Design a protein around this nucleic acid. Structure first.
Lengths: 136, 1120, 398
RNA sequence: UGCGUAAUAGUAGCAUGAUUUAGUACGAGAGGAACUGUCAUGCCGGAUCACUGGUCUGUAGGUUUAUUUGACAAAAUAGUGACCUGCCGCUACCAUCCGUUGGAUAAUGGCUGAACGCCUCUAAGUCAGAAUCCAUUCUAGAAAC
RNA sequence: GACGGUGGCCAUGGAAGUCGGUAUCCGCUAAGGAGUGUGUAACAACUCACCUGCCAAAUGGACUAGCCCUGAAAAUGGAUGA
């Protein structure tokens, strides 16, 4: 799932961390944390984490949030990777700290996206682009 | 029109008889895109098709190709053209694909509809279901033919094939016409011709000059083979088209100078102009020359297409010029191949100049056609109508001028309500209350506020771009946001969304009402209003308020501040509707109840009762999940009533957790609804449905029942009935080959019974249930019956003046009129087929007079033993030959029941009984201050004298007695010969020559037989008659469709139930009888599982008690 | 045992399995295309020299992309491309065993290549008078007769011929004490035509402009960096000593099983890190430059915007160990075999190809100048720094 | 002693997604494709270091502790005193660039066509045709020239 | 060429040789089953059984056993000893 990239996949993979990394929910829904289970499309090989997306969809969970949203897996969307990258451009976007949002399995983000969102992510997921006034 | 406002429309909407209701409709929403596309462009309050396609309307090419994609929506499409108003409104009724009540409901939300009929297939369950209602109503529906630019663009043929297509359409429609009505003379009109203008003075006079030729209606005033005064159309939408015959005529007119009417006639069928100088010579009207469409009009279109394909800039322009219209602006602005076409078909498209006139010509007033549509659907009922003398107070004068009153009282009519907890836009807030502000918003929230919205959205959290010219400019709806407001307005606020919280009072519906204003009162009617109920389906007519006549007496009023369909949503501005309209109830009302028509009158004869069933009785006894949400289901079913006409919520016959539907998938849909769009719970479904009737084939043999039909000596009727059960629980004492009695006390209190067949007509009426519950119980306290006594006799023949049993009557002399009083348990539901036979005044304190059922007849006293009888033999009628289910298709007989039996048979069982009760023998006459024996004597009037010396207070105790009656009866049934009387709907399937065999095959596969065929007079269509069971008739239409291409149209009429060969058994509940071992296939069939999860049904009765009672679990059986 | 995974590829391609120290410190050739086009001006192969890399922005031409034209930085390899002098011809002969060098035919033109194939003759490892002309250099006037005699022979003998080419590098700063000879199989036209062309060449000294285009897919051949005696953890893509509690430095762990009861050839093992040839294929090239010396020195990119204000392309200073540009160059799209005293024998691709972004003609914008601690962005940053002060920063370090 | 040849051996790229096709074919419907093209990714393989990140005996500079050299200063010891920067260098799908095309077949589909008047992909004969086969390209270079 | 009584009787608007079932008989002919299939809503049409024209002398089945093939896949490369 979902899947819709992009055109392209907005080029190479970069992560803040793979499996077992907290990033904030950045969402009006009362998920307060997002912890990764795994990432979609990772086919992977012998001993290698299923590694965080640059703006791609993930199997996640609400570890600390609303108890209703707590437990039960959730497809999400990575929004900003603390750990850095170069783009086809020659810039190195880098962030304060990791972040994403909990989302629908057609990609759609629920409420409104908080804070700054890398443009690649927006490009990937049109709903994301729609539901924010910050796309930097 | 690009510019229209609601300020102009509200004033012109007040007046009536010059408005003309028009509606959009199709068989499965086929040709919906085409109709809508052309209308959107025309409409001005949405600012053309540039800022169009808002307020729910999803256009698709799939549909055109052939596709349903059904949806419930509405666009506010009023027109302030010239000096008049035009209440069109884009009605999109989803309907349903199979025949049903749903189809009847949804489709009836239309006045003066245009109907798209036959996509690329006819004589289906689709076309004969939805449009079955529309062509029945004489509302002057116009013949809209399918897309013609498919033949030009997609398939790529010459315009000569258009004619062929038209012909084909006509042919298809002929079949449809011949389902109802008659179509022997109309097969001549299912062709393409114009036999007029063959004379020399016509061929060069009215072809060069104008003159005039008639285009008026002929024979039929429906959609069958008529021009409808120049409103027949060829509706297309690939780049948007809005055109038809009129358009074609217009072009022709422009070439030299011929009248439009004349031209239209020519263009309906074939006409042959030689084109020397638009003058014709005869010889070409018997042989031919060249038809019109390929000569001119569509030829031009074809040429244009060709030009486009090749890519020519001036050629296209030239073609356009030739075609007799202006060439437009976008010819050297863009490269313009399709763009040019698009440009032209925004200038060309506003049909309001042409079509409105045509409409007017067709339809002088909506007042006229309203008189012809009362007698075509339910208004009094299925028997009588309001147009006839039954139910006539002030209706005939009212619906001639339309509406109930000219001052607007409001009414109701079901057309399926909107889904709550999603849309909840009707509110008690200032901006909908203020009717002007909302109107203003509506006219400004198409492409004007959109820019503002955009500005708000992108530039509020600050910095979307990084080092760009978005934050630098900071637009307030100026130069940047002006773009992207012509192909589609980005974020325009289409339906005026919910600013404040949800308060759901949404409803779809129809009401015809006069000039309604804001702050208008209506007298709200209760959850069950008796007066209303008493008015419909009978000749009664009266208007009075509650004086204890309804269940709830009330003197309270409800407000009604608007009339809305939710087409522009919220509390609208356009509320001053004329007599006759497409809108439903508004204000704070979503009550479209069955027994509560919202009116200003406190009670009135209901104008439309809720819709009628296509196939009678489709049910399922489901149960919900998790404990607190048990009444939730019930609550939901109150909302379900509002939506669909039939659900078992009002009046408990089978209990409130049961659906009532007509259809194949309708039931399924209903099931899904109460998980989704009403109550948000989740419930246990059970797709096995409809328990069949259990008929006993013949009586038992010589054992303890001497009055009988001789012998039961058969091996098996279809499955064995002798060695499968019985003969050892209470058969070790008496009866070798079977068991028709009991020996628990062992001849202290015993009985013997018989189950004969009963004639089928008689059964049918019984099972309809004409008798009431009070007709069989408590006649001393309530009123003593009279009209009901003879009716019963007419059905089941038995009386207190019959001392030779049931046998005499069943055989000889049917339909007598006598009193059938003093009956305990007349059937399983107390209104059914079974009866307990009185063949005695008094045996020995048994078998005479009910608990309080009397005919004013007594041998000595009314006192007898009615308490132990009535409860016992009720349970005997509810456990069949395989345990469970009601005895249906049977007239029960009681040979004898004898209490106070001083005889007895020496055995272990007897000994045990003796030990238990310490009685030397049974009685009632005597006592030792021991045991029980309840009777009717004690509660009615104390002691018993005359019929017996002492009152019965002795013999086996009452509970035990009650138990034992059930047991013996159960035993008797089990041993008797029995067959499965399967539930049936006869299939009067409209079929054609090639698809009879296929249909028959299906029937063969799924049980039944073809009885006979009836042929339609003067057509290739027939109608085949064939019985088919009810259980297999579900998913039948779909199957038919799959088999060929839906060329046969099914319709399931109810034609009683019949005996067919299937194993009528199910594993016995008693483990002593399961030692015989009923087989897993033949004594537990898949057809015979309608009981584990298909029998939880009780408004009236479904009680099954645990048999045998004898003190404690240690003292029950010790020597036994 | 199953395995039990799947993947275990041989960590490493087996395709380079001998992994020796490759002999020829120029990209050794053993492969060219074949043709008979009237255009025989193509020779197949140049040889330049790597002297570092820089980077460049260029708007890219590949519609269908997320953006059809958009600025992007690409890295870029630059190589000094001096003159290829051609001291002789070598003919060949077609045969069973392969081909053969019967004997060469050298004209005259230059004799600097000679005192590189030298200073190694007789007792004490080496001497500086020639003991041998015994596989070597002929005369001049009494040399051309031989050529005439043998030209005719090679004209007739249809086996292909290559030119005994060589680059000039003592004209660069590197002062190479190794001989830098290279074959260039002449292609296109008749055998006779080819030999005539070769003959003509001896009179001249070609440069790369004639061989390749500004937009032209090369297959670079070089010698990768020879990183030393080195470990398996580092020589292949093998995951290491599983734990800290483990007892190895330099291991696989299993090296082949009791299985066939001797070790297998193919098993990850440490040796020395690839100093091989390899052939990086289809380097599109963005520019041939004009040669620096005797004007062209202050001209590597022309006009302001799209070539920007004038400059030399080169990376500044003499470098603590390395080279700085002084001749015409090739802007190969990123990366090549080895470091910066290393010979990139070039050859046009075998299967020259259209595809998409193999041929797409291409334009540039800003271009870097390296090292950030000590210097900045060439002439502009030179100026600003100077203005700020001459005690602080100017941007020239010898 | 040059510059070559290439027997022999090994051999590498594999795969996905989006998009076009196309909401077209197909389909009663609900749903719903492909050949080709286009742009990217996963893993893998070969390089590289223009960029960025990583590191530090560059003990290159600073900041600071304790100590010692009378103070200032400049140095030491503290087995690299600690800390912040940090070059060259080495390196990270923690960066970048690169990984082709011919015949031969398999299954299989045919063609003519007998045995066997017809008929048949077959027996004679032969057409197309896999990630296959073998070459091309690529690594090494024989007591081989 | 492959007909008639004939839509034989059943079931069945209809199923006529052929949804399906039964009895399955005779006339005329060299020749034709109340019919092998295809097909038809079903009839028909074609095809078969059945008969003749031409070509012109061999043909058809059913088994039997010799070799060959199918069956017949496992692990370092590979063994009629080569």
């Amino acid at each position: 799932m979902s899947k819709a990239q992009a055109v392209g996949s907005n080029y190479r993979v970069s992560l803040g961390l793979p499996v077992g990394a907290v990033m904030n929910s950045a969402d009006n829904s009362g998920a307060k944390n997002l912890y990764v289970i795994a990432v979609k499309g990772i086919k992977g090989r012998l001993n290698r984490l299923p590694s965080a997306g640059v703006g791609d969809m993930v199997m996640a969970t609400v570890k600390k949030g609303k108890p209703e949203l707590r437990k039960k897996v959730c497809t999400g969307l990575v929004v900003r990777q603390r750990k850095h990258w170069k783009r086809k451009d020659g810039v190195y976007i880098y962030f304060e700290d990791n972040a994403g949002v909990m989302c629908n399995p057609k990609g759609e983000v629920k409420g409104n996206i908080l804070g700054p969102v890398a443009k690649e992510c927006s490009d990937l997921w049109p709903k994301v682009a729609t539901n924010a006034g910050t796309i930097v | 029109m690009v510019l229209n406002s609601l300020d102009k429309m509200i004033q012109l909407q007040k007046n009536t008889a010059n408005i003309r209701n028009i509606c959009v409709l199709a068989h499965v929403d086929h040709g919906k895109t085409t109709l809508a596309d052309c209308l959107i462009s025309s409409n001005g309050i949405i600012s053309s098709r540039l800022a169009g396609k808002l307020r729910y309307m999803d256009s698709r090419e799939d549909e055109q190709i052939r596709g349903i994609t059904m949806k419930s929506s509405a666009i506010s499409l009023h027109y302030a053209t010239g000096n008049e108003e035009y209440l069109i409104n884009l009605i999109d009724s989803p309907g349903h694909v199979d025949f049903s009540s749903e189809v009847s409901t949804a489709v009836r939300i239309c006045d003066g509809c245009i109907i798209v009929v036959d996509a690329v297939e006819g004589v289906c369950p689709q076309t004969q279901a939805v449009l079955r209602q529309a062509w029945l109503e004489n509302i002057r529906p116009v013949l809209v033919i399918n897309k013609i630019d498919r033949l030009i663009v997609e398939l790529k043929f010459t315009p000569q094939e258009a004619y062929s297509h038209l012909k084909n359409i006509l042919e298809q429609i002929n079949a449809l016409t011949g389902t109802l009505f008659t179509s022997k003379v109309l097969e001549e009109r299912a062709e393409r011709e114009t036999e007029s203008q063959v004379n020399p003075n016509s061929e060069q006079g009215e072809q060069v000059y104008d003159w005039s030729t008639g285009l008026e209606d002929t024979d039929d005033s429906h959609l069958y083979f008529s021009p409808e005064q120049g409103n027949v159309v060829f509706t297309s939408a690939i780049d948007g088209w809005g055109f038809g015959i009129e358009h074609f005529a217009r072009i022709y007119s422009q070439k030299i100078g011929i009248k439009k009417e004349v031209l239209m006639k020519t263009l309906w069928g074939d006409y042959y102009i030689n084109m020397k100088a638009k003058k014709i010579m005869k010889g070409d009207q018997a042989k031919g020359k060249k038809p019109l469409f390929v000569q001119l009009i569509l030829e031009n279109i074809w040429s244009l297409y060709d030009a486009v394909l090749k890519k020519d800039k001036d050629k296209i322009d030239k073609i356009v010029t030739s075609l007799g219209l202006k060439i437009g602006a976008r010819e050297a602005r863009h490269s313009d191949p399709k763009v040019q076409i698009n440009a032209i078909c925004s200038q060309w498209l506003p049909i309001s100049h042409a079509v409105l006139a045509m409409v007017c010509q067709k339809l002088p007033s909506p007042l006229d056609i309203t008189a012809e549509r009362v007698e075509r659907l339910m208004c009094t009922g299925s028997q009588t109508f309001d147009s006839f003398p039954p139910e006539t107070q002030a209706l005939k004068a009212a619906f001639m001028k339309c509406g109930s009153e000219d001052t607007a009282p409001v009414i109701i009519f079901v057309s399926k309500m909107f889904a709550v907890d999603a849309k909840a836009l009707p509110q008690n807030k200032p901006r909908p209350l203020t009717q002007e502000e909302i109107a203003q918003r509506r006219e400004r929230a198409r492409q004007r506020h959109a820019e503002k919205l955009a500005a708000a959205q992108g530039q509020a959290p600050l910095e979307p771009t990084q080092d760009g010219s978005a934050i630098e400019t900071c637009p307030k709806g100026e130069e940047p946001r002006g773009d992207e407001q012509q192909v589609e307005s980005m974020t325009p606020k289409p339906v005026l969304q919910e600013e404040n919280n949800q308060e759901s009072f949404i409803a779809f519906a129809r009401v015809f009402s006069g000039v309604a204003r804001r702050g208008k009162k209506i007298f709200v009617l209760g959850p069950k209003y008796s007066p209303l109920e008493f008015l419909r389906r009978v000749p009664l007519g009266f208007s009075a308020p509650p004086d204890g006549l309804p269940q709830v007496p009330h003197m309270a009023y409800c407000a009604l501040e608007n009339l809305y369909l939710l087409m522009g949503r919220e509390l609208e501005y356009l509320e001053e509707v004329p007599p006759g309209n497409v809108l439903g109830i508004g204000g704070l009302q979503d009550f479209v109840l069955k027994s509560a028509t919202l009116c200003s009158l406190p009670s009135c004869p209901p104008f439309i009762p809720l819709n009628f069933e296509a196939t009678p009785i489709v049910r399922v006894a489901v149960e919900p999940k998790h404990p607190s949400e048990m009444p939730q289901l019930v609550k939901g079913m109150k909302l379900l009533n509002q939506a669909d006409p039939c659900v078992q919520i009002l009046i408990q016959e089978t209990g409130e957790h049961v659906l009532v539907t007509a259809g194949e998938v309708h039931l399924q849909r209903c099931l899904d609804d109460l998980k989704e769009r009403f109550a948000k719970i989740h419930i246990s479904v059970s797709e096995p449905i409809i328990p069949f009737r259990e008929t006993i084939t013949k009586p038992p043999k010589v054992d303890m029942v001497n009055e009988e039909i001789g012998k039961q000596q058969k091996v098996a009727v279809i499955h064995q009935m002798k060695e499968d059960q019985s003969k050892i629980p209470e058969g070790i004492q008496v009866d070798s080959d079977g068991l028709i009695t009991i020996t628990t006390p062992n001849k202290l209190a015993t009985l013997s019974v018989r189950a004969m067949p009963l004639p089928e007509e008689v059964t049918q009426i019984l099972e309809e249930n004409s008798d009431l519950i009070r007709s069989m119980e408590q006649l001393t306290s309530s009123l003593n019956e009279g009209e009901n006594t003879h009716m019963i006799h007419q059905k089941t023949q038995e009386k207190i003046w019959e001392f030779k049993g049931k046998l005499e009557q069943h055989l000889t002399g049917r339909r007598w009129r006598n009193i059938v009083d003093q009956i305990w348990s007349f059937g399983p539901r107390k209104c059914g087929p079974n009866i307990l036979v009185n063949k005695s005044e008094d045996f020995q304190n048994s078998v005479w007079t009910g608990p309080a059922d009397k005919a004013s007849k007594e041998a000595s006293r009314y006192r007898d033993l009615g308490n132990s009888i009535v409860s016992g033999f009720q349970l005997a009628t509810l456990s069949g030959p395989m345990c469970e289910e009601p005895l249906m298709g049977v007239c029960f007989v009681l040979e004898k029941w004898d209490l106070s039996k001083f005889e007895e048979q020496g055995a272990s069982d007897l000994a045990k009984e003796g030990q238990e009760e310490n009685e030397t023998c049974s009685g009632g006459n005597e006592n030792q201050e021991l045991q029980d024996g309840c009777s009717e004597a004690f509660e009615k009037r104390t002691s018993q004298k005359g019929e017996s010396p002492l009152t019965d207070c002795y013999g086996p105790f009452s509970g035990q007695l009650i138990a034992t009656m059930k047991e013996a009866c159960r035993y008797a049934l089990q041993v008797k010969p029995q067959r499965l009387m399967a539930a049936m709907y006869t299939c009067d399937i409209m079929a054609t020559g090639d698809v009879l065999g296929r249909v028959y095959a299906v029937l063969s596969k799924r049980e039944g037989r073809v009885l006979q065929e009836e042929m339609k007079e003067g057509t290739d269509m027939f109608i085949i008659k064939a019985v088919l069971p009810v259980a297999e008739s579900f998913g039948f239409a779909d199957e038919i469709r799959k088999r060929t291409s839906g060329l046969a149209s099914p319709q399931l009429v109810f034609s009683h139930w019949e005996i067919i060969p299937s194993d009528p058994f199910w594993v016995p509940t008693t483990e002593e009888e399961y030692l015989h071992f009923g087989e897993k296939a033949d004594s537990e069939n898949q057809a015979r599982k309608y009981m584990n999860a298909v029998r939880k049904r009780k408004g009236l009765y479904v009680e099954e008690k645990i048999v045998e009672h004898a003190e404690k679990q240690r003292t029950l059986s010790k020597n036994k | 045992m199953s395995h039990r995974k799947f993947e275990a590829p041989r960590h490493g391609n087996l395709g380079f399995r001998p992994r020796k120290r490759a002999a020829r410190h120029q990209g050794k050739v053993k492969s060219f295309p074949k043709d008979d086009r009237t255009q025989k001006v193509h020779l197949t192969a140049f040889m330049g020299y790597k002297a570092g890399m820089t980077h460049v922005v260029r708007d890219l031409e590949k519609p269908g992309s997320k953006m059809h034209k958009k600025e992007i930085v690409e890295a870029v390899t630059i190589i000094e491309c001096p003159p290829m002098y051609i001291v002789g011809l070598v003919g060949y002969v077609e045969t069973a065993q392969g081909l053969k060098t019967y004997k060469t035919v050298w004209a005259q033109h230059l004799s600097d290549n000679f005192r590189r194939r030298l200073y190694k003759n007789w007792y004490k490892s080496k001497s500086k008078k020639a003991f041998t002309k015994y596989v070597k250099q002929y005369e001049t006037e009494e040399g051309k007769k031989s050529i005439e005699a043998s030209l005719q022979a090679i004209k007739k003998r249809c086996s292909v011929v290559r030119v005994i080419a060589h680059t000039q590098v003592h004209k660069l700063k590197l002062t190479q004490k190794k001989a830098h000879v290279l074959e260039i199989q002449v292609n296109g036209g008749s055998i006779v035509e080819k030999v005539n062309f070769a003959v003509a060449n001896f009179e001249k000294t070609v440069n790369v402009t004639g061989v390749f285009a500004e937009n032209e897919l090369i297959d670079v051949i070089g010698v990768t960096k020879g990183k030393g005696f080195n470990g398996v953890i580092k020589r292949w893509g093998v995951r290491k000593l599983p734990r800290k509690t483990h007892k190895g430095l330099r291991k696989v762990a299993c090296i082949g099983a009791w299985h066939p009861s001797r070790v297998s050839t193919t098993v990850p093992r440490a040796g020395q890190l690839g100093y091989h040839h390899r052939v990086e294929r289809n380097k599109k090239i963005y520019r041939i430059g004009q040669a620096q010396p005797e004007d062209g020195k202050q001209i590597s990119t022309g006009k302001t915007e799209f070539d920007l204000t004038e400059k030399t392309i080169n990376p500044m200073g003499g470098f603590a160990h390395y080279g700085m540009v002084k001749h015409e160059f090739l802007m190969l799209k990123g990366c090549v075999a080895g470091p910066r005293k290393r010979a990139l024998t070039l050859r046009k691709s075998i299967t020259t190809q259209t595809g998409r972004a193999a041929l797409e003609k291409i334009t540039l914008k800003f271009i870097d100048t390296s090292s950030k601690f000590g210097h900045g962005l060439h002439q502009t940053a030179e100026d600003k720094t100077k203005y700020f002060g001459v005690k602080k920063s100017r941007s020239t370090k010898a």
